[PDB]
Amino acid sequence: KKVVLGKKGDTVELTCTASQKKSIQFHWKNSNQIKILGNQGSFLTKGPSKLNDRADSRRSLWDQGNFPLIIKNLKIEDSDTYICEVEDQKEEVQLLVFGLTANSDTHLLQGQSLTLTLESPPGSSPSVQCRSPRGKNIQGGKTLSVSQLELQDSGTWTCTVLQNQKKVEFKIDIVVLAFQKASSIVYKKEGEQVEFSFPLAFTVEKLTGSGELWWQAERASSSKSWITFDLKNKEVSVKRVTQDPKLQMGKKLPLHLTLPQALPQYAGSGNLTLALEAKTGKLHQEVNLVVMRATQLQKNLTCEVWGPTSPKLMLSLKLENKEAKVSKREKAVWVLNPEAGMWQCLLSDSGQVLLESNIKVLP
């Protein structure tokens, strides 16, 4: 009742051993008495089975009393019981051949699904467990499906098939393209020339990609504001659009959404959607910009932080020398009546300083 598990397209070696270390008559048959292979003296014979072109022995072991059935390029339909007849005795082995394929041979996107399908012989009911590089585990029988892939799922998945207390292992390479950042965030001040950056992971491929960035300026519901770009290899180019501010873009693959001067109205969220192909999908990665404006009215001052600020942060204005001239939790604080000193406006949260903008007072 011996059981051997094979992999589709692999080779297997089914063993037969005589009592004595000498070459004797042996023959391999299947469960329907179809001759696979045997010897005639020292010679190999092959029977009229469907295995004929893929069956062999190792004749260098026959003088050792070993008469193996080697089957290459295993097919699912090679699953059968095989019998070696040697010295008036029968040695029985059940071969079960499995195959395991991803439903996609092409690179996948983050958030897209992955489905593995186990090819199995009639009358077998195996369990399957597969594990991604990140440790994601999926279990099943015929089909195993992960709803949403993570970037960290890219690489070699290891799948174990369990059948008859035996197991066999499949390694499947999964390739997906994903952004290397979720919410990028830049804290600048009325003036500071803003830069943004969203990287990928090299790739080639033909006619392949273009999308655009969308922005929700703070208060200025005046949306539909954007920039459109087409890509091909290490070549990028603005399809058209931009307008509104002077956003400049690069000619080179490592995308740099440039914002000439960080003016106050350019604060808010944004989604940079990328979508290429062969068998498309669309990447996304968030973008956000905050601005701080430290400016003394007349003999009295004020400063304010626009954009995506947290209801957890604080703002403060002091003349650096001495401590807190005004501390608070909001985006538009004021300090009426300042004294000479190179004042610092401070935006943070918890403790670590986020935005810092210096400015002096006169008398």
UniProtKB/Swiss-Prot annotation:
Glycans are attached at N271, N300. It is found in: Cell membrane. Palmitoylation and association with LCK contribute to the enrichment of CD4 in lipid rafts. It comes from the Eukaryota. One of its GO terms (biological process) is positive regulation of calcium-mediated signaling. It is a single-pass type I membrane protein. Residues 101-178, 179-292, 293-349 form the Ig-like C2-type domain. Its main location: membrane. Residues 1-363 are extracellular. GO terms for cellular component: clathrin-coated endocytic vesicle membrane; early endosome; endoplasmic reticulum lumen; endoplasmic reticulum membrane; external side of plasma membrane; membrane raft; plasma membrane; T cell receptor complex. GO terms for molecular function: coreceptor activity; enzyme binding; extracellular matrix structural constituent; identical protein binding; immunoglobulin binding; interleukin-16 binding; interleukin-16 receptor activity; lipid binding. Residues 1-100 form the Ig-like V-type domain. Keywords: Adaptive immunity, Cell membrane, Disulfide bond, Glycoprotein, Host cell receptor for virus entry, Host-virus interaction, Immunity, Immunoglobulin domain, Lipoprotein, Membrane, Palmitate, Phosphoprotein, Receptor, Repeat, Signal, Transmembrane, Transmembrane helix. Highly expressed in T-helper cells. The presence of CD4 is a hallmark of T-helper cells which are specialized in the activation and growth of cytotoxic T-cells, regulation of B cells, or activation of phagocytes. CD4 is also present in other immune cells such as macrophages, dendritic cells or NK cells. Changing D63R: Increases the affinity for MHCII. Disulfide bonds join C16-C84, C130-C159, C303-C345. The Ig-like V-type domain mediates the interaction with MHCII. Forms disulfide-linked homodimers at the cell surface. Interacts with LCK. Interacts with PTK2/FAK1. Binds to P4HB/PDI. Interacts with IL16; this interaction induces a CD4-dependent signaling in lymphocytes. Interacts (via Ig-like V-type domain) with MHCII alpha chain (via alpha-2 domain) and beta chain (via beta-2 domain); this interaction increases the affinity of TCR for peptide-MHCII. CD4 oligomerization via Ig-like C2-type 2 and 3 domains appears to be required for stable binding to MHCII and adhesion between T cells and APCs. Interacts with Aedes aegypti long form salivary protein D7L2. It is linked to Immunodeficiency 79: An autosomal recessive disorder characterized by childhood onset of recurrent and recalcitrant skin warts due to uncontrolled viral infection with human papillomavirus (HPV). Some patients may also have recurrent respiratory infections. Laboratory studies show a complete absence of CD4+ T cells. Integral membrane glycoprotein that plays an essential role in the immune response and serves multiple functions in responses against both external and internal offenses. In T-cells, functions primarily as a coreceptor for MHC class II molecule:peptide complex. The antigens presented by class II peptides are derived from extracellular proteins while class I peptides are derived from cytosolic proteins. Interacts simultaneously with the T-cell receptor (TCR) and the MHC class II presented by antigen presenting cells (APCs). (Microbial infection) Primary receptor for human immunodeficiency virus-1 (HIV-1). Down-regulated by HIV-1 Vpu. Acts as a receptor for Human Herpes virus 7/HHV-7. This is T-cell surface glycoprotein CD4. The lineage of its organism: Eukaryota, Metazoa, Chordata, Craniata, Vertebrata.
